[PDB]
């Protein structure tokens, strides 16, 4: 989902490694703020949920990313269409579990609901 290793190590680390460093176009700074902001908000979410958050935020996974999963998920075509038209519900029934962080890589697992039973007649009972 994000390559900070490539940007930092290939564009910044060689500069900062030296005694006197220079930054010319300030736009460079803003582009770094943009890329780095997503990391900071994901880190903040985990620190207040001990690595278990629900629902799954747009910080954890954008809708473009989630549908790439749902389309590539090992589920039935009906399940695909069901989840896709109601993704915000899938978010609420999902958990984002922080896993590990080593070897210049950060990883966390996302638990997704898969609906094995669909379109059976449901009914709600009110009592008083």
């Amino acid at each position: 989902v994000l390559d900070l290793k490539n940007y930092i190590d290939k564009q910044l680390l060689p500069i900062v490694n030296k005694q006197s460093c220079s930054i010319p176009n300030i736009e460079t700074v803003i582009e770094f703020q943009q890329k780095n902001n997503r990391l900071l908000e994901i880190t903040r979410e985990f620190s207040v949920n001990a690595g278990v958050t629900t629902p799954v935020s747009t910080y954890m996974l954008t809708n473009s990313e989630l549908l790439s999963l749902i389309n590539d998920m090992p589920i039935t075509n009906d399940q695909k269409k069901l989840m896709s038209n109601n993704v915000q519900i899938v978010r609420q029934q999902s958990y984002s579990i922080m896993s590990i962080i080593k070897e210049e890589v950060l990883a966390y697992v996302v638990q997704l609901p898969l609906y094995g039973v669909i379109d059976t007649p449901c009914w709600k009972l009110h009592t008083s």
């Epitope: 564009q11 910044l12 060689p14 500069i15 030296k18 005694q19 220079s22 010319p24």
Partner: antibody
Framework: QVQLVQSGAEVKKPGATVKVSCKIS????????IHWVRQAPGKGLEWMGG????????FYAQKFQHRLTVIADTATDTVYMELGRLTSDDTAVYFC?????????????????WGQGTLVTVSS | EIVLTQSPGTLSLSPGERATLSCRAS???????LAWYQQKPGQAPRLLIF???SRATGIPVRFSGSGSGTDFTLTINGLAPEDFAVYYC?????????FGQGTKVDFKR
């Protein structure tokens, strides 16, 4: 505290060969650049060659490419220079410095570390 | 064959006045690869500015560089006593470095 230490003063007769070292303390060689520039007494500065630890590539000035050799030992964090076929025109002071210019889209970076200078006198 | 020129050869000015030093090249050099160094008698060179308009760490703000293409200029806004020395401009291209002959700075006495 990064410091560069050069070899002592040397005197060599015409036609001989002279070796000057440049020892690095407080920093690794593989992440720095090390170049040799000489100064004849009372004259300007003249580039000779250099070493780029970032790429492990050596550069020579075409004026001395045929008779100058530069060696870098990464294990000792030391750079040596050797110029042969010495004549009275080679009598000068020799320095090692970090002229390496790092270029990225985001900006530039450079080190500025120098030795104390090495007096080399060539005469018969 | 990259050739560098500096004007004047010797400049004499009083402390507190502005020193303007020129550096001109026989051909176009990349601005990132240009640098300016200062040398006092008996010392190794010190790097002042590099990439035209970028001061090194710890260099006072009174020093400022500018230039492009073939003509480059180091400007000192208000000469300090410790500024009276020799000033070399340094070009580089394809990691082939080339030094100017240097401009000497003198006390206007």
């Amino acid at each position: 505290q990064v410091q560069l230490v050069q070899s002592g003063a040397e005197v060599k007769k015409p036609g001989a060969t002279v070796k000057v070292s440049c020892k690095i303390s407080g920093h690794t060689l593989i992440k720095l650049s090390i170049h040799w520039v000489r100064q004849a007494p009372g004259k300007g500065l003249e580039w000779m060659g250099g070493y780029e630890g970032e790429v492990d590539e050596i550069f020579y000035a075409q004026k001395f490419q045929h008779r100058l050799t530069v060696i870098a030992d990464t294990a000792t964090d030391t750079v040596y220079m050797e110029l042969g076929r010495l004549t009275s025109d080679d009598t000068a002071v020799y320095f090692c410095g970090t002229l390496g210019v790092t270029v990225t889209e985001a900006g530039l970076g450079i080190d500025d570390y120098w030795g104390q200078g090495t007096l080399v006198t060539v005469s018969s | 064959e990259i050739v560098l020129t500096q004007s004047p050869g010797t400049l004499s000015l009083s402390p507190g006045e502005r020193a303007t030093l020129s550096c001109r090249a026989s051909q176009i050099v990349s601005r990132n690869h240009l640098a300016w160094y200062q040398q006092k008698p008996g010392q190794a060179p010190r790097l002042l500015i590099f990439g035209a308009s970028s001061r090194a760490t710890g260099i006072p703000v009174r020093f400022s560089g500018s230039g492009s293409g073939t003509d480059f200029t180091l400007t000192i806004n208000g000469l300090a006593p410790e500024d009276f020395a020799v000033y070399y401009c340094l070009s580089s291209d394809s990691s082939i470095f080339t030094f100017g002959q240097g401009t000497k700075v003198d006390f206007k006495r």
